[PDB]
Amino acid sequence: MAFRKSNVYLSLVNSYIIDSPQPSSINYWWNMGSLLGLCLVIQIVTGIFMAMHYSSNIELAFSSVEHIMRDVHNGYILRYLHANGASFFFMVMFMHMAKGLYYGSYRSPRVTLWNVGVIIFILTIATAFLGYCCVYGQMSHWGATVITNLFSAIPFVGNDIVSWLWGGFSVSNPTIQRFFALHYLVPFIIAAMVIMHLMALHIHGSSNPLGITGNLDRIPMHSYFIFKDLVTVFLFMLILALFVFYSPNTLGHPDNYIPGNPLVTPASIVPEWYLLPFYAILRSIPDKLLGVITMFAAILVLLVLPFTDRSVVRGNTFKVLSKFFFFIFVFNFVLLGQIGACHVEVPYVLMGQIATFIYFAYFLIIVPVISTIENVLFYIGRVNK
Amino acid sequence: MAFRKSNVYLSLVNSYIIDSPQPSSINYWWNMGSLLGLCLVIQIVTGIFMAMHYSSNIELAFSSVEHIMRDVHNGYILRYLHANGASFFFMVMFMHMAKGLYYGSYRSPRVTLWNVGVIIFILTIATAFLGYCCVYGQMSHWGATVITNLFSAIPFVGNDIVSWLWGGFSVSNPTIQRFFALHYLVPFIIAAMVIMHLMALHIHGSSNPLGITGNLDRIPMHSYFIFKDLVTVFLFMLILALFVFYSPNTLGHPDNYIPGNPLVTPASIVPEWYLLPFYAILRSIPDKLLGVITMFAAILVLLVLPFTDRSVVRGNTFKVLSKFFFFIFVFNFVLLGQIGACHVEVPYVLMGQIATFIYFAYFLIIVPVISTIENVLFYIGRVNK
Amino acid sequence: QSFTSIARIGDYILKSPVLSKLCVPVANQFINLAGYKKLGLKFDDLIAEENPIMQTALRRLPEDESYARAYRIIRAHQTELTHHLLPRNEWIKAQEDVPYLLPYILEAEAAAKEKDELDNIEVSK
Amino acid sequence: GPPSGKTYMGWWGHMGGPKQKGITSYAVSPYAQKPLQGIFHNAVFNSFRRFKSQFLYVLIPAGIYWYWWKNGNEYNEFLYSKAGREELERVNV
Amino acid sequence: GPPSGKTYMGWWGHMGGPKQKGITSYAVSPYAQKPLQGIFHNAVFNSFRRFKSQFLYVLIPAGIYWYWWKNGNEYNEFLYSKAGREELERVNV
Amino acid sequence: MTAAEHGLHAPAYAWSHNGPFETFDHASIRRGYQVYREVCAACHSLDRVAWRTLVGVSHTNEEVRNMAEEFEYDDEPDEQGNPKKRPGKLSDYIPGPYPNEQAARAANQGALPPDLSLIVKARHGGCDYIFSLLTGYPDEPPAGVALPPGSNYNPYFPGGSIAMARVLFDDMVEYEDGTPATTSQMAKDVTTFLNWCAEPEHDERKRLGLKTVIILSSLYLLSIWVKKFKWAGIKTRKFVFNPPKP
Amino acid sequence: SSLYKTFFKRNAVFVGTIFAGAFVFQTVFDTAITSWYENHNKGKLWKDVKARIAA
Ligand SMILES: CCCCCCCCCCC(=O)OC[C@H](COP(=O)(O)OC[C@H](O)COP(=O)(O)OC[C@@H](COC(=O)CC)OC(=O)CCC)OC(=O)CCC
Ligand SMILES: CCCCCCCCCCC(=O)OC[C@H](COP(=O)(O)OC[C@H](O)COP(=O)(O)OC[C@@H](COC(=O)CC)OC(=O)CCC)OC(=O)CCC
Ligand SMILES: CCCCCCCCCCCCCCCCCC(=O)OC[C@H](COP(=O)(O)OCCN)OC(=O)CCCCCCCCCCCCC
Ligand SMILES: CCCCCCCCCCCCCCCCCC(=O)OC[C@H](COP(=O)(O)OCCN)OC(=O)CCCCCCCCCCCCC
Ligand code: HEM
Ligand code: HEM
Ligand code: HEM
Ligand code: HEM
Ligand code: HEM
Ligand SMILES: CCCCCCCCCCCCCCC(=O)O[C@H](COC(=O)CCCCCCCCCCCC)COP(=O)(O)O
Ligand SMILES: CCCCCCCCCCCCCCCCCC(=O)O[C@H](COC(=O)CCCCCC)COP(=O)(O)OCCN
Ligand SMILES: CCCCCCCCCCCCCCCCCC(=O)O[C@H](COC(=O)CCCCCC)COP(=O)(O)OCCN
Ligand SMILES: C/C=C(C)/C=C/C=C/[C@H](OC)[C@@H](C)[C@@H](OC)[C@@H](C)CCc1oc2c(O)c(OC)cc(OC)c2c(=O)c1C
Ligand SMILES: C/C=C(C)/C=C/C=C/[C@H](OC)[C@@H](C)[C@@H](OC)[C@@H](C)CCc1oc2c(O)c(OC)cc(OC)c2c(=O)c1C
Numbered sequence A, B: 001m002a003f004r005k006s007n008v009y010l011s012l013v014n015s016y017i018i019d020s021p022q023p024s025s026i027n028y029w030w031n032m033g034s035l036l037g038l039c040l041v042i043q044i045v046t047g048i049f050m051a052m053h054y055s056s057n058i059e060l061a062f063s064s065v066e067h068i069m070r071d072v073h074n075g076y077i078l079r080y081l082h083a084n085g086a087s088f089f090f091m092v093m094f095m096h097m098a099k100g101l102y103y104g105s106y107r108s109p110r111v112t113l114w115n116v117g118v119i120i121f122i123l124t125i126a127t128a129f130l131g132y133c134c135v136y137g138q139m140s141h142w143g144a145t146v147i148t149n150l151f152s153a154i155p156f157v158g159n160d161i162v163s164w165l166w167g168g169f170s171v172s173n174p175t176i177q178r179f180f181a182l183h184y185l186v187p188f189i190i191a192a193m194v195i196m197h198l199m200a201l202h203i204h205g206s207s208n209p210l211g212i213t214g215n216l217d218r219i220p221m222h223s224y225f226i227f228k229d230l231v232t233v234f235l236f237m238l239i240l241a242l243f244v245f246y247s248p249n250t251l252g253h254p255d256n257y258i259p260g261n262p263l264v265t266p267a268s269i270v271p272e273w274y275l276l277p278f279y280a281i282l283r284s285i286p287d288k289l290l291g292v293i294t295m296f297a298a299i300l301v302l303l304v305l306p307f308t309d310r311s312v313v314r315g316n317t318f319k320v321l322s323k324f325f326f327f328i329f330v331f332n333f334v335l336l337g338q339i340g341a342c343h344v345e346v347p348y349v350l351m352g353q354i355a356t357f358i359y360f361a362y363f364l365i366i367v368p369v370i371s372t373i374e375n376v377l378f379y380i381g382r383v384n385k
Numbered sequence C: 001q002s003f004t005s006i007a008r009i010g011d012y013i014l015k016s017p018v019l020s021k022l023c024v025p026v027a028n029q030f031i032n033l034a035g036y037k038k039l040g041l042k043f044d045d046l047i048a049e050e051n052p053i054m055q056t057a058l059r060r061l062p063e064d065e066s067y068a069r070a071y072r073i074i075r076a077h078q079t080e081l082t083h084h085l086l087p088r089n090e091w092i093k094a095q096e097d098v099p100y101l102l103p104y105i106l107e108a109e110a111a112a113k114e115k116d117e118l119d120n121i122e123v124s125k
Numbered sequence D, E: 001g002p003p004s005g006k007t008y009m010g011w012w013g014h015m016g017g018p019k020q021k022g023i024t025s026y027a028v029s030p031y032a033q034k035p036l037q038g039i040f041h042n043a044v045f046n047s048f049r050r051f052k053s054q055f056l057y058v059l060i061p062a063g064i065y066w067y068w069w070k071n072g073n074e075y076n077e078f079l080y081s082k083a084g085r086e087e088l089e090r091v092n093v
Numbered sequence F: 001m002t003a004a005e006h007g008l009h010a011p012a013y014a015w016s017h018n019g020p021f022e023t024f025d026h027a028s029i030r031r032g033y034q035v036y037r038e039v040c041a042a043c044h045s046l047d048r049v050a051w052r053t054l055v056g057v058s059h060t061n062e063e064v065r066n067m068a069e070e071f072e073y074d075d076e077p078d079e080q081g082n083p084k085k086r087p088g089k090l091s092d093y094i095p096g097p098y099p100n101e102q103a104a105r106a107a108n109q110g111a112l113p114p115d116l117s118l119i120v121k122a123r124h125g126g127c128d129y130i131f132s133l134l135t136g137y138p139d140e141p142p143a144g145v146a147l148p149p150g151s152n153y154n155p156y157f158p159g160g161s162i163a164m165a166r167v168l169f170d171d172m173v174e175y176e177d178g179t180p181a182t183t184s185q186m187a188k189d190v191t192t193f194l195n196w197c198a199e200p201e202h203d204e205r206k207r208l209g210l211k212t213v214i215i216l217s218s219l220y221l222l223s224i225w226v227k228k229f230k231w232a233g234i235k236t237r238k239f240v241f242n243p244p245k246p
Numbered sequence G: 001s002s003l004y005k006t007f008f009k010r011n012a013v014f015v016g017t018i019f020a021g022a023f024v025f026q027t028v029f030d031t032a033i034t035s036w037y038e039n040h041n042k043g044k045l046w047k048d049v050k051a052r053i054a055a
């Protein structure tokens, strides 16, 4: 037997990266996974190196990031890579998830795979949030305040949890310092979940754009997909380099270049772009508690897809109605994000409420109705009886 | 089949902790591994929670540990658990390694298991070093100073490596801040290494006190060993509790209760007890370069044992000469530690030099000579001609 | 260390009256102090088996002795786990502590040695 | 290792697919093929055909959403101009 | 699942040992045994068994090292007392 | 190392807080503070100790509030930006005697009196050493020992030559509770107070230790009994061999 | 032991009861320890000294 298959350690590398039987027809959309792995490594490495020059003290945080920006050799590259890297991490993750909805990657026998993914998504969002808090700009402070306060909605113990998360009367020293400690911790938890993710992927293998069995024609991971993934890796690095060196602050907010001030919430306050859709959902509900529940349900409803998809075939490739409504969903998500960046004003408030409804209706009403209808369309459109 | 065997995640738990076939006769010495797992968890959990109230800046480091001792609820418990925990971690690792030496655990087919273990030992010592530096007491400063300087012995690039490690002209702010960053990192690498350790352990299973095959009589891990391990878990906790609440500082040095001072090295300087033997080895060589080499070789020589043991049977249980020299070695190791705690004075210097030679001679001379003699003794003591 | 090597040195001593009168007694003492007989094991039962030579030997060992070996091993692990010794009347006696596997081991070792030599023979044209 | 829970995928030699018979495949070494410099003129026009079968599934919804946004954004601008303060006061509170 | 290497240990049903025949074993339910009193009957009585059999292999090297330590420790004490400064000047530099 | 260089070993006194079940003597802590304030404070700081920690330990809320209000601290500047002072509060730390290291060394012939907040844990010997040092100054150094101009002989100090002169003398303080203020009594009292400064969690630490050790001791014995039960079938397992027929 | 049978009758104690018992044990055990501890240290505690200092 070849040493790569016989050795205890290399055999794992071989089964996941070398001899892994991949469906011959997977397209570039199946390259997002490896790209997400790259993102995690970029975040961890750039983060550890910056951590070496960081001070979590609330009185020293902002200045310590400025110290990295000015005094640390190549320090601006670390920060711009880390910061822009976060956004790219989310853009690639959204595409990874979208790819899933589209090709029915969430359905049997891959539900465990999908559920772990939803878990990872939540963890990543919390991580990115904790990270943003460590800069301690104006957006950092208020983001920390709003988000920790999200828990004050829990009845009875509500305000107690917030006080506990803060470690005091308001977002202050104890909060920033613990948030840095947790920011360092979660990425390793995510790495562990990614292993669980890959474990669940492995026993069933990847699906393909045709939505049918790939067992009749598999090709090895090595060379074919190792080199195909390299294509997207370089593209990913090219686009990211463009932002890091030429437009480092386009995806950010100017207000975060201002030290946190406990007495002033800027009128120009806006959440990080990747959280806008969820933020818009929360604002659409004129009730505190219902607002936070709906926003959290917006993430959890992703778990319902395996059951509401009544279709007898996996994927949207051969489904006119599903393909159409899928894009309604994508652009509705984008719109929810746009509403998020707007002020709570007349036309926008209604648009957000209707878009929020469409967001939930997609998983709970549209998918099951459309899939059922298509099941019957495929049948009567050929069966002659 | 049972869900614990068919589920992708549970089957891992089942194979390592439930249905795992253990030799029916493994004694309490085989409980040290589970204990090291507990230590790692204890160290990580307590470290993270303390991390929430710690400041790496060389000016706030010492006082932030004092802040954890005085202002943090149960903070002194966290710190004493962490500090005393580190000590117990080494006492248990020393016993685990000694168990390995005595029972020929390092012998084929468990060589990789042993080698990864040597890796873990090194990472664990480096982690402990980095953690001690974070306190920033007198011992911390000078320990950071002496140990980083170990690399100045590398010819040519030696001094650059040290300036690079320090991040300046001497152990200072950038040194403590990166050391804390690194202290946070390595425990996660050790965990990764522990998983590799267990993977190697799993393909061959544990050995036993008789040194012969355990294949004829195995009993499941669950119940028998899950409960046998619980016995040592509680005794470990009881003893750690005795130190933590009743004698929390007897294993440390009072000099680390004095803030580090770059201009004064205390005359009472002494390394942490678990590092004393290696310290004694280095101190025995009247040459800078040769001194660091020999000290590092003292750890690496553990790698030669699989090849220097010529015995035709695994383990010391039935070998009078091997048993006697095994204890010479153990006691020589304790003496090396006691020598380390003494001053560089006449009787002690020669004793250390002699003990250092005994340490290396055990692996390179005594073991191969004695094992060869015992092979012949077992033969001529029965065969007629 | 190979058994061929052990045997070569051992036979040499065992044939020499001078060395034999000097060493054997010390060896007898060593084996009694070793204590494996008190566990009911024969020396050959102690040989580490996780290597090709021993697997070959254990394969070739006749059925009946193989079942006997298995019993001594199982009985030993049980005795050892209880922290006792077997009653004296169950201890292996010196007469019984016979090198039953040794001939199979030496045979396997010689075959591998030849195979190694033949795999690396040089040719003189 | 322990008994493995069976899935819908196997490995080389026992992939889990149906028995294959009667199908023959042929392939030529990449080393013996035209140095991939024949992407244009031979099959450059073959493109567009791919994104002509799909553009409507993306474009119509994108168009539906673009106008909904453009329509609401203009209304907002009017509501907040001197001219719109009349309607703004009514629709607002 | 991929083919991994062979080892000297298998799993329940194919552990890797020789074929077993002729051995019969017996056991009794822990529920039917005398409510554990063997902690102070056959544990304290059989106590010091593991002691008197092995202690010499530990005690002799322990004693050798302890003596060497005490001897060198006392020599140091003398070397640094008033009575030892003469021999101290000699053996040192 | 010579005896002089080592320093005299400090004997073991019977501190009422020595022992797994003993708390500090709070009356001794309270008396110790007085000795610190009236005798040591002039040269030694207690920087890590906040007034509020004395409350409920050696003084009442009122007593500490009044003690703190006798000291000035930098307040927030006025509306014009000019600096202003304010009376201390429970949240403040016991003020030191010197503005900086330079001023301290100047008032002590180049020597720097260390902060005593951790002195008990920062020296081998603990309380025994502190007490022995404070009460161990002889009237004159031993014969043959030349003392550096500005130094004082104390056998317990490594080297024997210490920059601090003996400061404790019979009845230099008048204890509030009428206790005879002898040198050794004062030494005993401040040392006790200094131990509290270094280990304020002491009393609470030992109380939890008793709880923790009783639970774990029980847990340990329990686990042994349970283990023996789950292993009873294996421990008494019997084997019999009947050579199979060929 | 019939003392055990009357409460659990040949069944092992269930989690709910175990947890419930743990809650009762914490309260009762703490009180008993604090009580023993404070009494062993009578005259030394601040509350005891505060009573003394009355002038
Ligand atoms: C956004 C900020 C962060 C993200 C940065 C990273 C971006 C990567 C994500 C993009 C992605 O996944 O796109 C996938 C689609 C699907 O494509 P497909 O149906 O499987 O491909 C058939 C190939 O042309 C076969 O052709 P090929 O022989 O493999 O060469 C393909 C093409 C690949 O180009 C790429 O870089 C891949 C996107 O190279 C070229 O000839 C053109 C070079 C510009 O690729 C597309 O063409 C997009 C269509 C909308
Ligand atoms: C400073 C930091 C220290 C941290 C480390 C703390 C953990 C220490 C681990 C101790 C250890 O590994 O020692 C193992 C040896 C080997 O022992 P053996 O051959 O396998 O046992 C036969 C049993 O009696 C079987 O007997 P058993 O029925 O399983 O009960 C055994 C005994 C176990 O006690 C323990 O907790 C084990 C140490 O329970 C009792 O009866 C004690 C009642 C008070 O046990 C000994 O001989 C101990 C002397 C070294
Ligand atoms: C919490 C909720 C998570 C979900 C959030 C989702 C957010 C949206 C994610 C952003 C990007 C959207 C990615 C689109 C999803 C995958 C698209 C896809 O797979 O398209 C496949 C389709 C044709 O593919 P076929 O396999 O069916 O072809 C068969 C040939 N016989 O090929 C096509 O349709 C053409 C490609 C379409 C490009 C996508 C355009 C939308 C771009 C959004 C712009 C972002 C604004 C900032
Ligand atoms: C870098 C390299 C590091 C390695 C250095 C070594 C680590 C330092 C040593 C620390 C303690 C380790 C003690 C030795 C390890 C356990 C030894 C062992 O496994 O002993 C087994 C033995 C009896 O067991 P048997 O199975 O052989 O009995 C025959 C039954 N038929 O059991 C016995 O013989 C009794 C065990 C006696 C232990 C006494 C140990 C003395 C240690 C000094 C303590 C240090 C504190 C200052
Ligand atoms: C850091 C996060 C993640 C990493 C590193 C990761 C990585 C991967 C990898 C390597 C693959 C195989 C190749 C591919 O399909 O791209 C994969 C497949 C998959 N992942 Fe993820 N993933 C992550 C997050 C998620 C999330 C958030 C979801 C869903 C909510 C998800 C859902 C899926 C699904 C369903 C598949 C199977 C797709 C198919 O074969 O059709 N993953 N992932
Ligand atoms: C793997 C996922 C990670 C993500 C998604 C992530 C994301 C972020 C985000 C959003 C920020 C704010 C960027 C800005 O606007 O300045 C940030 C900051 C920071 N992160 Fe992370 N991070 C990750 C991992 C890590 C790790 C492992 C460390 C290690 C300690 C780390 C250390 C830091 C530090 C020190 C900062 C502050 C300096 C800065 O602004 O870049 N991060 N992180
Ligand atoms: C974080 C530290 C470590 C962990 C968690 C760990 C854990 C374990 C565990 C759970 C076992 C099986 C049960 C036992 O024999 O105790 C084991 C076995 C073993 N470990 Fe480690 N170990 C560590 C470090 C080391 C080191 C430093 C070495 C060697 C230099 C080592 C050598 C071995 C060997 C040789 C065995 C097999 C023993 C036998 O079956 O005879 N381990 N270890
Ligand atoms: C294998 C695990 C670990 C080991 C062996 C270890 C060891 C040490 C040691 C020896 C010290 C100095 C103890 C003292 O004298 O005060 C220390 C301090 C410290 N460690 Fe760790 N550590 C470990 C893991 C962690 C982790 C994961 C973190 C970070 C989340 C952490 C954070 C700290 C902090 C905050 C200090 C300073 C407070 C103190 O002095 O205890 N440690 N560590
Ligand atoms: C009873 C009140 C006092 C206490 C409890 C006290 C305690 C101490 C202690 C424990 C040391 C540490 C010695 C060592 O390094 O081991 C010390 C040093 C010192 N003390 Fe005091 N002291 C007191 C009053 C004073 C006074 C009034 C002054 C200032 C005139 C003074 C000046 C010094 C100096 C200069 C040192 C430096 C010793 C050296 O390094 O040689 N002390 N004291
Ligand atoms: C990293 C490693 C750290 C720890 C390693 C130690 C391994 C032992 C884990 C103990 C789990 C016991 C579960 C038993 C079980 O499920 O069997 C259940 C029975 O469980 C019980 O009776 C509960 C007894 C109380 C368990 C004590 C908790 C241990 C304290 C935790 C300390 C560990 C840090 C099956 O019982 P049955 O077989 O009779 O039907
Ligand atoms: C969180 C962790 C997730 C899972 C971890 C597993 C992932 C494995 C990734 C690691 C890839 C690197 C493998 C290199 C090892 C291959 C060589 C080898 O195993 O040789 C080993 C010896 O290895 C050693 O001594 C050191 C171990 C290396 C430790 C690396 C940090 C020989 O072992 P061998 O397989 O040949 O045994 C049969 C021969 N009688
Ligand atoms: C450092 C980590 C190293 C990586 C090793 C991973 C080992 C994991 C050890 C812990 C195992 C404990 C959790 C396993 C959960 C078992 C239940 C399960 O798998 O149910 C799953 C569904 O699980 C989910 O939806 C969410 C799983 C989230 C896990 C969060 C930790 C049922 O999966 P099922 O096996 O029945 O699939 C049948 C085929 N259609
Ligand atoms: C110790 C760790 C803790 C406490 C972690 C808590 C994690 C909570 C959630 O993660 C799972 C949460 C981050 C996630 O909710 C699902 C996001 C979508 C929340 C989106 C979000 O962002 C905002 C933001 O970023 C801002 O910045 C300036 C300002 C904001 O209002 C003005 C918001 C905001 O109103 C909302 C809803
Ligand atoms: C960024 C990461 C870095 C630089 C990691 C470096 C790792 C180095 C080694 O770990 C692999 C090292 C810790 C290990 O050497 C093998 C130890 C046995 C070193 C033993 C050691 O301790 C001392 C010590 O503790 C002191 O305290 C006050 C003082 C010391 O002299 C006065 C020493 C000393 O003279 C030696 C040899």
Ligand SMILES: OC[C@H]1O[C@@](CO)(O[C@H]2O[C@H](CO)[C@@H](O)[C@H](O)[C@H]2O)[C@@H](O)[C@@H]1O
Binding pocket: F137, F138, F139, F140, F141, F147, F148, F149, F150, F151, F152, F153, F165, F166
């Ligand atoms: O600072 C005290 C001062 O006293 C001198 C006077 O010669 O030393 C003698 O008196 C001291 C105080 O009683 C003793 O501590 C000292 O041991 C004794 O020789 C000076 O040397 C010293 O500076």
